[PDB]
Amino acid sequence: HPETLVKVKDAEDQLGARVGYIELDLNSGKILESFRPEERFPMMSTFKVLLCGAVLSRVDAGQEQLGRRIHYSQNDLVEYSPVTEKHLTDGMTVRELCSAAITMSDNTAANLLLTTIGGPKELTAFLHNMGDHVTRLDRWEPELNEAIPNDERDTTTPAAMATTLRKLLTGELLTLASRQQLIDWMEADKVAGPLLRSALPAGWFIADKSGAGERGSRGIIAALGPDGKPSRIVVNYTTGSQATMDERNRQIAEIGASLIKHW
Ligand SMILES: [Xe]
Ligand SMILES: [Xe]
């Protein structure tokens, strides 16, 4: 809806920074609404959904098991590792690592999962063989959040991400079980509170994954809808602003309020 794009134009002018935005119908797959859809934005933690999609593709093929246990050392711990820091002795299963990566944005969980699939280049190869030849991962956590302006490393476009998310969620690649698992993780996201969820009515379904990094970078990808069922995928990034994380949150939330109002 036009009013939602005013809000994106609002946010962009207020934050003084680029903002990309996609509304995508989950059923027909048709773009409902767009803004800077072909510009690149840092993915930040929003990559962890694609990472687990790749892990789950390996699980589907028997190259990986969700119950396999991974042990690690304290030296492998990087910044912000709420769950993985607590299991140095007993390790974690691949399922537990994807749960921590998606629901809590656990950084060490991401790197460990990246090692299982063969690194960022292997994740980019996965996305490439999915029809996404735009999205790329180059670095590990936490260096992938550097968000250097015009740096194409660790970036995606709003249109590439929304399409990739739709295929991961409602495509034919992953098995029906792996698709339900990936969205289950997104639905139990514990670190996206003040964003899209804040403008969301009771009874609505939402599964998401947010990101934040350097140089005013903030974002969110989400599959949401009323009556307990998802019906649209929405993508929103921003980068460059000197604004606080609080004002970034409140901008994404306002655009979300207009999206909801105009459903
Ligand atoms: Xe934004
Ligand atoms: Xe949003």
Short mmCIF file of C-alpha atoms and ligand atoms in Angstrom, two decimals:
data_model
loop_
_atom_site.label_atom_id
_atom_site.label_comp_id
_atom_site.label_asym_id
_atom_site.label_seq_id
_atom_site.Cartn_x
_atom_site.Cartn_y
_atom_site.Cartn_z
CA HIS A 1 0.00 0.00 0.00
CA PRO A 2 1.12 3.59 -0.85
CA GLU A 3 0.91 4.63 2.82
CA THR A 4 3.44 1.97 3.78
CA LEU A 5 5.92 3.38 1.24
CA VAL A 6 5.36 6.87 2.61
CA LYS A 7 6.47 5.35 5.93
CA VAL A 8 9.58 3.90 4.29
CA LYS A 9 10.17 7.29 2.71
CA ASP A 10 9.47 8.69 6.18
CA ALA A 11 12.00 6.38 7.82
CA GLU A 12 14.63 6.99 5.17
CA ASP A 13 14.39 10.78 5.56
CA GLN A 14 14.32 10.65 9.36
CA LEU A 15 17.17 8.15 9.69
CA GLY A 16 19.10 9.77 6.84
CA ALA A 17 19.94 6.36 5.44
CA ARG A 18 18.98 3.80 2.79
CA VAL A 19 15.95 1.62 3.47
CA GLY A 20 14.86 -1.37 1.38
CA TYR A 21 11.39 -2.90 1.62
CA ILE A 22 9.49 -5.85 0.15
CA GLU A 23 5.93 -7.07 0.53
CA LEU A 24 5.47 -10.49 -1.05
CA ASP A 25 2.29 -12.56 -1.30
CA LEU A 26 3.12 -16.03 0.03
CA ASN A 27 0.41 -17.67 -2.09
CA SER A 28 0.73 -16.18 -5.58
CA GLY A 29 4.37 -15.21 -5.04
CA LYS A 30 3.71 -11.78 -6.55
CA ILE A 31 5.42 -8.62 -5.31
CA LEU A 32 2.75 -6.51 -3.62
CA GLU A 33 4.92 -3.53 -2.74
CA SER A 34 8.55 -2.51 -3.20
CA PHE A 35 11.18 0.10 -2.36
CA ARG A 36 14.87 -0.05 -3.35
CA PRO A 37 14.35 -3.77 -4.01
CA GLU A 38 17.54 -4.22 -6.04
CA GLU A 39 20.01 -2.41 -3.77
CA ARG A 40 22.42 -4.24 -1.49
CA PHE A 41 22.13 -4.27 2.29
CA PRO A 42 24.19 -6.10 4.95
CA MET A 43 22.41 -9.29 6.01
CA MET A 44 23.70 -9.38 9.59
CA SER A 45 21.95 -12.06 11.62
CA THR A 46 19.21 -12.46 8.99
CA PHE A 47 21.62 -14.85 7.21
CA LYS A 48 21.18 -17.45 9.94
CA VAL A 49 17.84 -18.52 8.45
CA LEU A 50 19.56 -19.31 5.16
CA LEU A 51 22.37 -21.03 7.03
CA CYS A 52 19.94 -23.40 8.74
CA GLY A 53 18.10 -23.89 5.45
CA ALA A 54 21.40 -25.17 4.06
CA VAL A 55 21.97 -27.32 7.14
CA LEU A 56 18.45 -28.73 6.77
CA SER A 57 19.08 -29.42 3.08
CA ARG A 58 22.06 -31.51 4.18
CA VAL A 59 19.84 -33.20 6.76
CA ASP A 60 17.33 -34.04 4.00
CA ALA A 61 20.14 -35.62 1.99
CA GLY A 62 21.51 -37.64 4.90
CA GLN A 63 24.72 -35.59 4.97
CA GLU A 64 23.67 -34.26 8.36
CA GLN A 65 21.63 -35.39 11.37
CA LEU A 66 19.71 -32.98 13.62
CA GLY A 67 20.61 -35.06 16.67
CA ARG A 68 24.35 -35.11 15.98
CA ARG A 69 26.25 -33.56 18.89
CA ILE A 70 28.92 -30.90 18.39
CA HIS A 71 31.57 -30.15 21.03
CA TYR A 72 33.67 -26.99 21.07
CA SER A 73 36.15 -24.98 23.13
CA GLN A 74 36.01 -21.60 24.87
CA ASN A 75 38.39 -20.16 22.26
CA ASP A 76 35.72 -20.77 19.63
CA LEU A 77 33.40 -18.45 21.55
CA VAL A 78 32.98 -15.02 19.97
CA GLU A 79 30.98 -12.06 20.99
CA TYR A 80 27.35 -12.51 21.99
CA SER A 81 26.94 -16.18 22.58
CA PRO A 82 24.04 -16.51 25.06
CA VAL A 83 23.42 -20.24 24.60
CA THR A 84 26.67 -21.74 23.31
CA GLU A 85 28.68 -20.27 26.21
CA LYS A 86 26.69 -22.47 28.59
CA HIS A 87 27.44 -25.84 26.96
CA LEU A 88 31.24 -26.00 26.76
CA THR A 89 31.29 -29.37 28.53
CA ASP A 90 28.30 -31.23 27.09
CA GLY A 91 28.29 -29.62 23.64
CA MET A 92 25.17 -29.01 21.58
CA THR A 93 23.22 -30.83 18.88
CA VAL A 94 22.81 -29.38 15.40
CA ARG A 95 19.14 -28.83 16.26
CA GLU A 96 20.10 -26.92 19.40
CA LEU A 97 22.60 -24.82 17.46
CA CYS A 98 20.05 -23.76 14.82
CA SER A 99 17.61 -23.01 17.62
CA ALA A 100 20.18 -20.74 19.28
CA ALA A 101 21.25 -19.21 15.95
CA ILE A 102 17.71 -18.31 14.91
CA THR A 103 15.80 -17.66 18.16
CA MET A 104 18.66 -15.97 20.05
CA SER A 105 21.01 -14.92 17.22
CA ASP A 106 23.83 -16.84 18.94
CA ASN A 107 27.02 -15.98 17.05
CA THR A 108 29.20 -18.95 18.01
CA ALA A 109 26.26 -21.18 17.07
CA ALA A 110 26.32 -19.63 13.59
CA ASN A 111 30.06 -20.18 13.05
CA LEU A 112 29.86 -23.80 14.22
CA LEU A 113 26.98 -24.46 11.83
CA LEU A 114 28.96 -22.70 9.08
CA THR A 115 31.80 -25.15 9.68
CA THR A 116 29.44 -28.12 9.21
CA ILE A 117 28.39 -26.97 5.73
CA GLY A 118 31.88 -25.86 4.70
CA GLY A 119 31.95 -22.12 5.40
CA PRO A 120 30.45 -18.93 3.88
CA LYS A 121 31.53 -19.91 0.36
CA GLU A 122 29.62 -23.18 0.73
CA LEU A 123 26.55 -21.29 1.94
CA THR A 124 26.85 -18.96 -1.06
CA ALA A 125 27.11 -22.03 -3.31
CA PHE A 126 23.93 -23.34 -1.68
CA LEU A 127 22.08 -20.09 -2.38
CA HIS A 128 23.43 -20.06 -5.94
CA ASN A 129 21.98 -23.51 -6.63
CA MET A 130 18.66 -22.18 -5.35
CA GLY A 131 18.29 -19.46 -7.95
CA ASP A 132 19.78 -16.72 -5.81
CA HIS A 133 22.87 -15.39 -7.58
CA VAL A 134 22.79 -12.09 -5.72
CA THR A 135 23.01 -12.93 -2.01
CA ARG A 136 26.55 -13.66 -0.82
CA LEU A 137 28.24 -14.52 2.47
CA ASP A 138 31.96 -13.85 2.76
CA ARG A 139 32.93 -13.59 6.42
CA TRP A 140 32.20 -15.24 9.75
CA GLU A 141 30.73 -13.87 12.97
CA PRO A 142 31.24 -11.26 14.10
CA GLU A 143 33.12 -9.72 11.16
CA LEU A 144 30.13 -10.08 8.84
CA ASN A 145 28.47 -7.12 10.62
CA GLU A 146 31.08 -4.54 9.63
CA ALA A 147 28.65 -3.05 7.10
CA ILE A 148 31.22 -0.97 5.22
CA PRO A 149 29.29 1.26 2.80
CA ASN A 150 29.15 -0.13 -0.76
CA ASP A 151 30.93 -3.25 0.47
CA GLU A 152 29.17 -6.12 -1.27
CA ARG A 153 30.46 -8.75 1.15
CA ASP A 154 27.85 -10.36 3.40
CA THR A 155 25.03 -8.51 1.63
CA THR A 156 21.72 -9.28 -0.05
CA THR A 157 19.00 -7.31 -1.82
CA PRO A 158 15.44 -6.99 -0.46
CA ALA A 159 14.13 -8.76 -3.57
CA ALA A 160 16.67 -11.59 -3.51
CA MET A 161 16.09 -12.25 0.20
CA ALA A 162 12.28 -12.22 0.00
CA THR A 163 12.35 -14.65 -2.94
CA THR A 164 14.93 -16.90 -1.28
CA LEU A 165 12.93 -16.91 1.97
CA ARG A 166 9.76 -17.85 0.07
CA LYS A 167 11.48 -20.80 -1.62
CA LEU A 168 12.97 -21.94 1.68
CA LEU A 169 9.57 -21.69 3.35
CA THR A 170 7.11 -22.64 0.61
CA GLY A 171 9.18 -24.28 -2.13
CA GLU A 172 10.05 -27.75 -3.09
CA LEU A 173 13.69 -27.81 -2.15
CA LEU A 174 13.54 -28.69 1.51
CA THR A 175 11.26 -31.51 2.60
CA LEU A 176 7.94 -30.70 4.27
CA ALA A 177 9.46 -31.61 7.64
CA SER A 178 12.48 -29.32 7.25
CA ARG A 179 10.26 -26.46 6.14
CA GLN A 180 8.07 -26.79 9.20
CA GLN A 181 11.20 -26.86 11.35
CA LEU A 182 12.77 -23.73 9.87
CA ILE A 183 9.57 -21.75 10.31
CA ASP A 184 9.11 -23.15 13.83
CA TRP A 185 12.50 -21.69 14.77
CA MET A 186 11.55 -18.34 13.24
CA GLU A 187 8.23 -18.37 15.08
CA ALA A 188 10.02 -18.83 18.42
CA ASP A 189 12.35 -15.88 17.77
CA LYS A 190 13.24 -14.26 21.11
CA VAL A 191 15.18 -11.24 19.87
CA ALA A 192 12.82 -9.35 17.54
CA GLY A 193 10.41 -7.98 20.15
CA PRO A 194 10.41 -4.23 19.44
CA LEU A 195 10.16 -4.61 15.65
CA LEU A 196 7.38 -6.16 13.56
CA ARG A 197 5.85 -8.03 16.50
CA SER A 198 5.19 -4.76 18.35
CA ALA A 199 2.70 -3.61 15.71
CA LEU A 200 1.10 -7.03 15.33
CA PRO A 201 -2.50 -7.76 16.46
CA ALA A 202 -3.51 -10.66 18.70
CA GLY A 203 -4.27 -13.90 16.86
CA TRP A 204 -1.84 -13.12 14.05
CA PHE A 205 0.91 -15.51 13.02
CA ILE A 206 4.49 -14.31 12.75
CA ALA A 207 7.80 -16.03 12.12
CA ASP A 208 10.84 -13.80 11.77
CA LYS A 209 14.55 -13.10 12.11
CA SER A 210 16.09 -9.69 12.75
CA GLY A 211 19.58 -8.31 12.32
CA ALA A 212 21.79 -5.50 13.60
CA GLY A 213 25.40 -4.54 12.95
CA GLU A 214 27.78 -1.63 12.42
CA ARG A 215 27.10 1.75 10.78
CA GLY A 216 23.38 1.94 11.53
CA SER A 217 22.54 -1.43 9.99
CA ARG A 218 19.22 -2.97 11.03
CA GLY A 219 16.84 -5.40 9.39
CA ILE A 220 14.13 -8.01 9.57
CA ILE A 221 12.73 -10.80 7.44
CA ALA A 222 9.34 -12.25 8.30
CA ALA A 223 6.48 -14.49 7.25
CA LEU A 224 3.28 -13.27 8.89
CA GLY A 225 -0.50 -13.24 8.55
CA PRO A 226 -3.82 -13.20 10.42
CA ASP A 227 -5.93 -16.07 11.78
CA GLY A 228 -2.84 -17.94 12.97
CA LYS A 229 -1.60 -18.53 9.41
CA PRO A 230 1.13 -16.75 7.44
CA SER A 231 0.13 -15.16 4.11
CA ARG A 232 2.89 -12.66 3.26
CA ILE A 233 6.65 -12.37 3.47
CA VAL A 234 8.04 -8.93 4.36
CA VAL A 235 11.66 -7.82 4.14
CA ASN A 236 13.11 -4.55 5.50
CA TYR A 237 16.69 -3.42 5.77
CA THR A 238 18.48 -0.18 6.58
CA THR A 239 22.15 0.83 6.76
CA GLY A 240 24.33 3.94 7.13
CA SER A 241 22.37 5.86 9.77
CA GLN A 242 24.00 7.32 12.87
CA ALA A 243 20.71 6.84 14.70
CA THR A 244 20.46 4.73 17.85
CA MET A 245 19.22 1.14 17.76
CA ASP A 246 16.12 2.44 19.54
CA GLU A 247 15.12 4.80 16.74
CA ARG A 248 15.93 2.12 14.18
CA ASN A 249 13.55 -0.26 15.98
CA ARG A 250 10.79 2.33 16.15
CA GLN A 251 11.09 3.06 12.42
CA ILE A 252 10.79 -0.59 11.40
CA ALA A 253 7.88 -0.89 13.83
CA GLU A 254 6.02 2.08 12.31
CA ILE A 255 6.33 0.75 8.74
CA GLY A 256 5.04 -2.48 10.23
CA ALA A 257 2.08 -0.64 11.73
CA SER A 258 1.15 0.71 8.30
CA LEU A 259 1.61 -2.74 6.73
CA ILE A 260 -0.76 -4.22 9.30
CA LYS A 261 -3.28 -1.38 9.03
CA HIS A 262 -3.29 -1.80 5.25
CA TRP A 263 -3.59 -5.57 4.87
XE XE B 1 14.37 1.38 8.69
XE XE B 2 9.02 -3.97 8.55
#
